[PDB]
């Protein structure tokens, strides 16, 4: 069993909580408390390896908690999530990446760019621009739908694979 510490970041309403709950518990959730920042644990098999995922589903917080501080110190990879129908959430991505680099004091932090809500045919964010933003960063771009489940495992499993790539290097 190998432990991986992941952190899910992104603007309010992009689907961080929905993605986390769909991954862990197999439910699509319409209204999960937007203020709750909680940690979840799931045992999954990825490429034949038994992985223990510790996932921080982040939220807007007024105080900097002991739980958040554990992930600040030992979090290994980040999912930077935007919604394909919210331009402002895509514009925040570069700020999330810049901040993660400073938090970890590293130009090489395992990260995946996630474009959520791809079940909606209405796209305000050009997915070609997202794939080019990810290419510019040297990271994978994954499309997801917490509603249909498409890409959900792919987003988190790709992040675990990026962490492995970082550990071996």
């Amino acid at each position: 069993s190998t432990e991986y510490k992941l952190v899910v970041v992104g603007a309010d309403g992009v689907g961080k909580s929905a993605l986390t709950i769909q991954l862990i518990q197999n439910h699509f959730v319409d209204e999960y408390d937007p203020t709750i920042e909680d940690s979840y644990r799931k045992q999954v098999v990825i490429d034949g390896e038994t992985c223990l995922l510790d996932i921080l589903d982040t939220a807007g917080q007024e105080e900097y908690s002991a739980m958040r501080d554990q992930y600040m110190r030992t979090g290994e990879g980040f999912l930077c999530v935007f919604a394909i129908n919210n331009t402002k959430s895509f514009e925040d991505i570069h700020h999330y990446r810049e901040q993660i680099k400073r938090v970890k004091d590293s130009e090489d932090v395992p990260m995946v760019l996630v474009g959520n809500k791809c079940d909606l045919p209405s796209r305000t964010v050009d997915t070609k621009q997202a794939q080019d933003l990810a290419r510019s960063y040297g990271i994978p771009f994954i499309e997801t739908s917490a509603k249909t489940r498409q890409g959900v495992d792919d987003a988190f499993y790709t992040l675990v694979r990026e962490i492995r790539k970082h550990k071996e290097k």
Partner: antibody
Amino acid sequence: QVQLQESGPGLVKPSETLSLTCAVSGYSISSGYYWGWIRQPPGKGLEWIGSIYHSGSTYYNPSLKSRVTISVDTSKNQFSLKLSSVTAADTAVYYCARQRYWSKSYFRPWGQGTLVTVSS
Amino acid sequence: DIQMTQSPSSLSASVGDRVTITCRASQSISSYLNWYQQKPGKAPKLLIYAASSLQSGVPSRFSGSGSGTDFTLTISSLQPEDFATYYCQQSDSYPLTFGGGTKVEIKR
């Protein structure tokens, strides 16, 4: 201000379907919250049956799932329960209640409860 | 399912006594535990949510404590009107589950 009230037949024959409605006042089901059904057999504890969101998304007690249908009517501001193939084990006071969020929340307020007896 | 075990199933205590009822979860639920009070012929009423937050309007003699798998509801000075069955309920995850209840009666 927010009030919930159950209604429906107090007598159901074995094998037939139990139907109840919860009339909501002081708040619109279409605005938010999860809307649930909880039951209490005479002299026993509480058992959560299921909950629904205004979108139609339903969550169930796994031991009752195959028999439960929960529905919402946002125009009438009501929600309902259908429990098929009833037996004497379904004789209970049925309560409706609401909770703000899907999880990590609480039920408040609750209806007054309505007794349903399964008998021929 | 997360099983909730309450103890004791019933107790008798005098007016003014401190009463403690326990709730144990089969796995960790952090602070996602609520307590309801049920009087005869009435619906359960929320007293405490999130393990220790007192519902507005509820008398200060009621308090809740605990986290993880072990929780307690305490009535610091039992009053005659506190005769009820008390139920805990985990709100961490589905299916939503309740403890079996604790019936509190007054010794007079």
